[PDB]
Amino acid sequence: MDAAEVEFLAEKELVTIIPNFSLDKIYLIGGDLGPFNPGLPVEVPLWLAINLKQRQKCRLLPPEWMDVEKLEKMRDHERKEETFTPMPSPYYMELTKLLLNHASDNIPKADEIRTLVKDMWDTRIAKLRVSADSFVRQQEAHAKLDNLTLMEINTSGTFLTQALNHMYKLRTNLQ
Amino acid sequence: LTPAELIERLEQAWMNEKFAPELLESKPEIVECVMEQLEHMEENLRRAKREDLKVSIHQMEMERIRYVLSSYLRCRLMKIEKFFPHVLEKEKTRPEGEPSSLSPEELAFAREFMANTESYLKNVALKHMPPNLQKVDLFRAVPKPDLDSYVFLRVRERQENILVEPDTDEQRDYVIDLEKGSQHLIRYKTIAPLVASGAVQLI
Amino acid sequence: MSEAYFRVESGALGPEENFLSLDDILMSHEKLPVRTETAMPRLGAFFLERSAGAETDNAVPQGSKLELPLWLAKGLFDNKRRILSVELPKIYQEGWRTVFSADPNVVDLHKMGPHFYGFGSQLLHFDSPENADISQSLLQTFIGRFRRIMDSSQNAYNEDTSALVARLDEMERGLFQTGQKGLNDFQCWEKGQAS
Amino acid sequence: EQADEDLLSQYENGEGLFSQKSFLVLGFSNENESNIANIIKENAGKIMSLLSRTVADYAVVPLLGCEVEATVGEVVTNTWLVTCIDYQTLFDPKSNPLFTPVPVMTGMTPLEDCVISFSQCAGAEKESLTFLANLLGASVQEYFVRKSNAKKGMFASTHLILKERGGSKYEAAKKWNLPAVTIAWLLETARTGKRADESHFLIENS
Amino acid sequence: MFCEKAMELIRELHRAPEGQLPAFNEDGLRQVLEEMKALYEQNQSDVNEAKSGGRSDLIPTIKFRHCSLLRNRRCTVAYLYDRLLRIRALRWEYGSILPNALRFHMAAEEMEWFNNYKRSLATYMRSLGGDEGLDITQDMKPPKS
């Protein structure tokens, strides 16, 4: 599994858009959507929001949590804590990338939001590095990681699993 | 029973196959139901890109589902090909009643792959080798699946009395409990029945 | 997904060699010192520098020190017939094991043996009281080098990593390459180049 | 005691035509693409789309091949197609080397100084052989002559290519001591870019 | 020394850049097979002398040659097997027709194996999904813009 499939799974998260046209509610295999009314908020999957945005048939609304002040406090909380903190959503990185790349005209201070999200990502990768180092150095067999996101696990899991396989082989070769 | 649950199960099997180090149990009903849903949806689509802004989205959902399906099937084929001799030997000795990890088509595929590779090895070198070096045991020459590989998992249903064995020193063995929703890292072999039963999800 | 092609993984660190692994074969082609316990007739033509004169049917004399490939020693090593005795290579003796216990990051593993870990693990098939110490030294070295491997793999874009990568074992090089591949994929995705 | 005995024992001496079939067409000009699609439809075949969600029974490509990005049942050439239509038979693609792309080393003209005439070849097969001969640099003349004739613009032939013993040109080549060789010689020369040894491929040795 | 040509074959195949198919080295294979035949004949003669002449002191030496035979066998199989994987990768990278330059490096038996592989894969894909089949080799990347 590559990062592109993780973003593909991220594209399922629901977001709120402002349609500028009318259309009867659609019955997708994944769920009902609509009805649509100009100027009325509607909840649709992120990929659909992006598609409509490219078609310039709606206005994208930024998530309530996507706020420079809130994101800055979340980053400071993650930095002050030694363990991983609960993330607002399981696909924050993909939603930030897609929204800032396709809706910068609707998101104020997109650059600062991108910097805050990149800082949070850096601090979580560093904390995952220190956690893997502690796990390996003590030759542990169990570790809890409820707050880790799919993107990071998929980014470094083949390396971590190969290293653990080698450590298990060396640890059990005396037979 | 609902389409949403069908898609969720499909994604579950896809992820589990991507991260499981061995071939998992076959899920024919899921592939079948998804192919039926796709056939129906494709049938109920017209062809007039003007005011039909609903087909330009239904076909997108269809492509996304087809992508997930194709990826899952490709991963299964890669695993079937990688360890084909051990998979065929395990299927041959599979006790009646336990769920099989191969569909009839996958069995045919594995048989043909084995036969083709054996024929190639025989015609290219074996017949030109000494009489006493023409039989190569494929069950030993081919690496076996590594069931002692670590994996990441997501707890779907709380589980208790799980025995963790750090090493060969039984004195270091201890019990742990898995709480619903938690995420863990552990050797696949230790939690294999929980993946098979569907109580846990490979991250 | 990943590339359709994957090298056959090494089984050298397990109980038995992997029959089809190219790295295992390359490891098994390295020569190690042995001592002959019985005379071997008709082999002098292959061990010319050990051909005692020329009237003993090119026999290999008893007590001759030879360099034989690992696979051949493993095939002939029988505890009952005692055809040959195996001597420990220098890098596995107590002094070098102590150097590894002191600092594993200073040793160029590629220069000393491109299959250091696999060869060391396969050496344990011979009955020796030091097998546990060899296993422990291998494990401690791996643990001692893992952190540096992670640091270099995750920061290779910002630091010249050629000197370290040139010193890595083949399995270690493969692991580094996998980590770098993951990093490259993430970077391409972040810039939108992954598609 | 059993292993030594086994070791010693190891050395002991003692109506519809293309109805249920799918085709892709790739690598052709727009006109030729449309022409091929039209022939396919006239012969009851179905044409599938690029990035099709289903697999195709056959991919139809030019004689020299092209990029075929999609999985298909069997890759065939337009020569195979035309031969099938002429004989109303679905020939096995493996039954003839001209039914699948032939590897050619680009830019090499090893027969540029050679003069070839063909015998026993007709229609699409003869056309494709002439195309390949020209691609390799040889001149192909309808008539088989042993001496150049400025007035008629014909040059003496250097090689006879044929399939079986028999016929006028074969006998003439024997009488005049000219080499008579199988098509495999030409296909191997094209594969290698070097003039193959005629004596290794003589029709008398086939 | 015994098994040098096989070792050269393995080194050549290992050194090839990822995904490139080097030319089939037939000469090395022929030389290895001839060496194996010679060793087999020498061991046969030595076993005959040990049994008829009671020269059991030659039995360990015979085992030496026997071990060498196994080494050659292993190397040969391993070499061919590695090549198969590369051919498989080519099927997934270029499609149903490989570029001519790569095609020129293959032996006839490798071509037959490739054809059988593609045939089985096509049959499997046709067997999936009822009447219409599913091409799973398409959309290798997420349809995301």
Numbering used by the authors:
A (entry chain B): 1 to 175
B (entry chain D): 21 to 223
C (entry chain C): 1 to 195
D (entry chain E): 484 to 497, 550 to 741
E (entry chain A): 1 to 145
Question: What did the study's authors say about this model?
Answer:
With all this information in hand, we could improve the resolution of our cryo-EM data, using an alternative GINS-expression construct, which omits the Psf1-B domain, and served to improve detail around the predicted interaction region. The resultant map showed a volume of extra density that allowed a short helical element to be incorporated into our model, consistent with the AlphaFold2-Multimer predictions. The hydrophobic side of the amphipathic GINI-core helix can be seen to pack across two helices of the Psf1-A domain, making interactions with the side chains of Leu490 and Leu491 of the GINI region and Val47, Lys51, Ile59, Ile62, Lys63 and His66 of Psf1. In addition, the side chain of Tyr494 in the GINI region is inserted into a small pocket on the surface of Psf1 formed by Tyr40, Asn43 and Leu69 with the hydroxyl group picking up a hydrogen bond with the side chain of His66. The GINS interaction surface in BRCT4 consists of residues found at the edge of the central four-stranded β-sheet, with additional interactions made by residues in the loops connecting the strands, including amino acids in the variant region between strands β3 and β4. Together, TopBP1-BRCT4 binds to the A domain of Psf1 and involves the linker region located towards the B domain. To our knowledge, this represents a novel mode for a BRCT domain-mediated interaction. In BRCT4, the interaction surface involves a region around beta strands β3 and β4. This region diverts from the canonical BRCT fold in that it lacks an alpha helix (α2)44 as if to create space for GINS binding. TopBP1 residues Val590, Thr606 and Val610 appeared to be involved in the interface, providing a series of direct hydrophobic interactions with the side chains of Trp92 and Ile97 in Psf1. Consistent with published Y2H experiments, our structural data indicate that the GINI core helix region interacts with both Psf1 and Psf3, at a position close to the distal end of the Psf1 A domain, whereas BRCT4 interacts with both the base of the Psf1-A domain and the linker that connects it to the B domain.
